[PDB]
Amino acid sequence: SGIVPTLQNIVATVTLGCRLDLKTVALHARNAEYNPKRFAAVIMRIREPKTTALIFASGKMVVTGAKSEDDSKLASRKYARIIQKIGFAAKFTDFKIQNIVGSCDVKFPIRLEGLAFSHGTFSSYEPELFPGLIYRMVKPKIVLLIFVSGKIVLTGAKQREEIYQAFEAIYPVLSEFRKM
Amino acid sequence: GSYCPRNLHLLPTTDTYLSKVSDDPDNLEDVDDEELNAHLLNEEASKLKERIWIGLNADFLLEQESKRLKQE
DNA sequence: CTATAAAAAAATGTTTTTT
DNA sequence: AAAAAACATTTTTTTATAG
Numbered sequence: 182s183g184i185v186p187t188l189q190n191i192v193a194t195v196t197l198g199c200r201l202d203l204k205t206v207a208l209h210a211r212n213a214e215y216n217p218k219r220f221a222a223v224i225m226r227i228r229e230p231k232t233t234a235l236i237f238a239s240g241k242m243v244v245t246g247a248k249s250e251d252d253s254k255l256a257s258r259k260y261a262r263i264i265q266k267i268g269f270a271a272k273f274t275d276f277k278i279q280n281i282v283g284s285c286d287v288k289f290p291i292r293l294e295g296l297a298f299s300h301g302t303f304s305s306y307e308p309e310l311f312p313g314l315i316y317r318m319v320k321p322k323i324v325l326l327i328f329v330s331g332k333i334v335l336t337g338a339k340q341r342e343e344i345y346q347a348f349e350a351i352y353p354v355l356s357e358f359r360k361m
Numbered sequence: 362g363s364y365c366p367r368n369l370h371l372l373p374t375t376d377t378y379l380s381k382v383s384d385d386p387d388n389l390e391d392v393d394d395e396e397l398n399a400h401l402l403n404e405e406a407s408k409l410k411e412r413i414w415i416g417l418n419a420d421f422l423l424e425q426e427s428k429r430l431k432q433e
Numbered sequence: 434c435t436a437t438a439a440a441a442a443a444a445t446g447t448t449t450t451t452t
Numbered sequence: 453a454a455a456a457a458a459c460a461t462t463t464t465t466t467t468a469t470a471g
Contacts, residue, residue, distance in 0.1 A: 182363050185372060190467040194440050208410045211400050215414065218421045220464050221443035228396065235441075235465055243440055245466040250378030258382070261389045263400050273386045278375070280439040284468055311436045312471045324437055328469055336437050336467085341375035349367050 186283035186335050186348050193232075193244035193253040194279050197264065197271035203238045209267045225260060232256035236264070240271055250341070253278060283335030283344045287352075290360035291331045300354060316351065323347040327355070 207215035207223045214224035222243075223236040232246030234256065242260060247253030254276055261273040293314040297306045306314040313334075316325035323337030323344055333355075338344045383391050402410070415422070 182367075187468095192439050192466075208407055208414060209401055211402065213410065215418075216421075217418070217443080222441080222464075224465080225400070226465095227400070233465055237441060237443090239442070241441065243465065245439085247466090250375045251381050254379055254382035255392055258389055258392050259397055262392060262397055265389065266398075266401055273389050276379075277440085280437095280466095281375070282438080282467060309471070311469095313436070313469070315437075326437065326469070330470080332469060334437070334468060336439085339375075339439095341373065341378065342369070345372050346369075 182349075182352055184285050184287060184348065186285050186333075186344050188247075188249055188281060188341065188344075189284050190245070190280075190282035190336075191247035191250065191253045191278060192280040193247060193257050194275075194277045195242055195244060195257045195261075196274045197240035197242070197261065197269075198274050199240045199269060199271045201238060201240055201264065201269045201271060203236070205268065206236060206264065210263060225263070227256065227259055230255050230259075234260055236260065250278070278339055280336065281338050281341060281344055283333070283348070285333060285348070287331040287333065287355055289331050291327060291329065291355055292358045292360055293327060293329060296327070296354070296358045299358075318347055318350070321346060325351055327351075331355075 203215055203217070203223055207213040210225055212225040212227065215222075220235070221237070224233065225236065226233045230252035231248065232244055232252070234245065235243040237243075242257065244253065244257040244260070247256055257276060258273060261271070264271050293306055294308070296314055297304050300316070303317050303319075304314060305317075312329060314327040316327055318325060318337075321338060321343045323335060325347060326334035326336070333348070333351075335344050335347050338347070385391065
């Protein structure tokens with residue numbers, strides 16, 4: 182009603198369109214974790230606009246870290262200046278955002294052992310397994326995590342507007358199920 | 362609001378937060394700002410990494426050199 | 434670690450064809 | 453049984469959130 186989910190995390194996928202050798206990429210950068218026995222990728226954890234990414238020897242890194250969409254696009258734009266300024270061709274093609282995450286505090290305790298009754302056709306709650314209540318929403322398909330205190334994780338969607346609808350929709354339900 | 366519900370497009374869209382950043386796929390030469398231009402170590406500094414990386418991964422490098430033997 | 438989701442490509446890990 | 457080309461998973465990365 183009066184609250185709107187804060188983007189705490191966005192995933193960005195991007196293609197650079199060239200099978201580029203990892204060996205070299207790492208040995209040219211401040212943030213250079215290549216462990217081919219471990220992960221098959223290089224790890225550059227840039228400072229501004231704050232990410233982590235994961236470059237692949239086919240040329241399609243996994244940029245994870247953004248707080249927004251200004252960041253996530255630039256985050257992945259900054260590995261496109263480094264890999265460029267090293268020795269490779271490699272463009273910036275198809276910036277697709279795979280995931281966005283959300284959160285906030287509805288500022289009151291929320292019962293979960295009863296939510297599993299009414300809206301339990303969408304729900305799965307095992308108390309001592311994971312204190313959260315998992316809400317599988319269909320329209321749109323964004324997964325909510327509803328904790329006892331009243332804090333919600335709204336990971337799932339690829340558009341920001343999507344996520345926000347998932348908060349608005351579940352609200353009159355977060356209001357009905359409470360500890361007065 | 363607390364009464365009649367939230368208006369759909371009075372909240373920001375991801376698509377306004379993407380169109381805020383440049384789309385040039387070739388000329389990514391608009392995000393250069395020194396700190397970025399400093400994620401690329403020189404000779405003496407790059408030579409030290411290759412030297413250290415080789416040692417940490419001399420584990421990895423032998424199985425891959427033996428993968429060169431199964432391929433011969 | 435438990436749990437959500439989301440990409441990605443080396444790699445081993447399963448089920449199932451074709452010898 | 454056996455060697456084989458077929459699917460499926462374990463790995464990693466971020467981030468908040470709480471038993």
